[PDB]
């Protein structure tokens, strides 16, 4: 039997990575990675590949007493992804989001740590492109909230490929995105942006989102796709569904969003009644 690990298991592996970094025992940390795992930290630099090279990269950070304060982990429906915001202290405070893939043995196959110069207290180098990308991520949410579909599309390239949730079909083109946002507005979606980070690759950013929407039609639709399981609401005409997710965007050379992924799994959904 080979099987991909469940949402709950991936969430726990990401938290356990932080507990072991904090406990300071390098061998404990390394045993959480696959033998040929890849680490990219920060996003934009060369991958560190395999446990030997990971030992070389992490050894100094553990000697300097790095500390990772985990936030809330987010899953997906691809059997592998988990996203964990954290605050990393060492002088310095950095806000990061680790995008992690857990493999079939329960071990981290891959870890991509998104954080920019502008998410970090230990460097004051300016990165106006970072701030522009984070502001585009936030902007997506404001334009959904305001019911401004035409405006939302203005942020996106005609080449846009998006996946929501991670683990479903990749959708392409402004027409598919238009249809999503038009439905969100019809279900009174409200997206409240929390933490933002940027990559240092001239391209990525990410935002935690807390979203509410009308129970009808999304709840029964999504339950029937086996994407969530909620209790039955006392009043389905008034109830709301909450989804906590992280949206990752990729921005092209022209400043337009050409890639977008929303990370949430069944364990990131809830019924708000009322
Ligand atoms: C056209 C909008 C509609 C939608 O995107 C559907 C197609 C997807 O959620 C479906 C159920 C799952 C993903 C999917 C997309 C496309 C194809 C071809 C698929 O096969 C699948 C799939 O998972 O099977 C849904 O989006 C919603 C609009 C309020 C919600 C769902 C949840 C949400 O994606 C949360 C980030 C966001 C708030 O939109 C509800 C609505 C039923
Ligand atoms: Na900074």
Q: Looking at ligand 1, which residue's alpha carbon is closest to its atom 10? A: 222
Ligand 1 within 6 A of CB of 270:
no
* Atom 24 in ligand 1: residue holding the nearest Cα: 168
Name the residue ranges covered by the structural domains of the chain: 1-126, 127-274
Q: Which protein residue's CA is at the shortest distance from atom 41 of ligand 1?
A: 218
Q: Judge if the beta carbon of residue 159 lies within 6 A of ligand 1.
A: no
Q: Output the CA 41–ligand 1 centroid distance in Å.
A: 32
**Residue 102: closest CA among 22, 230, 7:** 7
Could you tell me if 44 and 116 are in contact, meaning their C-beta atoms sit under 8 angstroms apart?
Answer: no
How far, in Å, is the centroid of ligand 1 from the Cα of 196? 23
- Which one of 3.10.450.50, 3.40.50.12280, 3.30.230.70, 3.50.50.60 gives the CATH number of domain 1-126? 3.10.450.50
Q: Under CATH, which number does the domain 127-274 receive?
A: 3.10.450.50
d(CA 86, CA 15): 10
83 beta partners:
74, 99
Q: For residues 75 and 84, is the Cβ–Cβ distance under 8 A?
A: no
- Whether 258 is catalytic is no
| Residue 71 Cα to ligand 2 middle (Å) | 20
Q: How far apart are CA 188 and CA 53, in angstroms?
A: 48
CB neighbours of residue 242 within 10 Å: 14
Give the separation between CA 46 and CA 57, rounded to whole angstroms: 12
268 is catalytic: no
Inter-residue contact 165 to 225 (CB < 8 Å):
no
245 labeled part of a ligand binding site: yes
For residue 73, report the phi and psi dihedrals to the nearest 5 degrees.
-75, 150
Give the largest Cα separation in the chain, rounded: 57
Name the catalytic one among 119, 129, 164, 252.
Answer: 164
Secondary structure, 3-state, the chain: CCCCCCHHHHHHHHHHHHHHHHHCCHHHHHCCEEEEEEEECCECECCEECHHHHHHHHHHHHHCCCEEEECCCECCCCCCEEEEEEEEECCCEEEEEEEEEECCCCCEEEEEEECCHHHECCCCCCCHHHHHHHHHHHHHHHHHHCCCHHHHHCCEEEEEEEECCCCCCCEECHHHHHHHHHHHHHCCCEEEEEEEEECCCCCEEEEEEEEEEEHHHHHHHHHHCCCCCCCCCCCCCCCEEEEEEEEEEEECCCCCEEEEEEECCHHHEEEECC
Across 79-114, b (16+ Cβ under 10 Å) vs e yields: bbbbbbbbebeeeeebbbbbbbbbbeeeebbbbbbb
Cβ proximity of 100 and 106 under 8 Å: no
Technique that determined the structure: X-ray
The reply to whether ligand 1 has any atom less than 6 angstroms from the CB of 168 is: yes
Find the 95 Cα to ligand 1 centroid distance in Å.
Answer: 30
Name, in order, each residue with C-beta under 8 angstroms of 171's C-beta and a sequence gap of 6 or more.
161, 162, 163, 164, 177, 180
């Amino acid at each position: 039997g080979r099987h991909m690990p469940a949402e709950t298991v991936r969430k726990e592996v990401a938290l356990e990575y932080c507990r072991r970094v904090n406990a300071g025992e390098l061998e404990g940390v390394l045993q959480l990675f696959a033998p040929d795992a890849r680490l990219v930290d920060p996003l934009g630099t060369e991958p560190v590949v395999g446990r030997a090279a990971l030992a070389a990269r992490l050894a100094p950070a553990l000697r300097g007493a790095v500390h990772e304060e985990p936030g809330r982990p987010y899953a997906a429906h691809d059997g592998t992804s988990v996203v964990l915001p954290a605050t990393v202290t060492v002088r310095g405070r950095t806000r990061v989001m680790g995008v992690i893939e857990v493999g079939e043995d329960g071990l981290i196959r891959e870890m991509r740590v998104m954080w920019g110069v502008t998410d970090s207290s230990w460097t004051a180098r300016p990165a106006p492109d970072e701030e522009r990308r984070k502001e585009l991520a936030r902007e997506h949410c404001l334009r959904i909230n305001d019911g401004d579909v035409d405006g939302l599309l203005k942020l996106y390239s005609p080449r846009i490929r998006f996946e929501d949730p991670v683990g479903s079909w990749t959708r392409t083109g402004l027409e598919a995105l238009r249809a999503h946002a038009t439905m969100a507005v019809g279900s009174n979606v409200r997206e409240t942006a929390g933490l933002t980070v940027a990559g240092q690759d001239g391209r990525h950013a990410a935002v935690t989102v807390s979203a509410t929407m009308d129970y009808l039609p999304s709840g029964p639709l999504l339950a029937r796709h086996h994407l969530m399981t909620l209790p039955a609401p006392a009043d389905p005409h008034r109830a709301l569904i909450g989804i906590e997710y992280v949206m990752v965007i990729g921005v092209d050379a022209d400043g337009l969003i050409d890639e977008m992924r929303a990370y949430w799994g069944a364990t990131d959904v809830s019924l708000l009644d009322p």
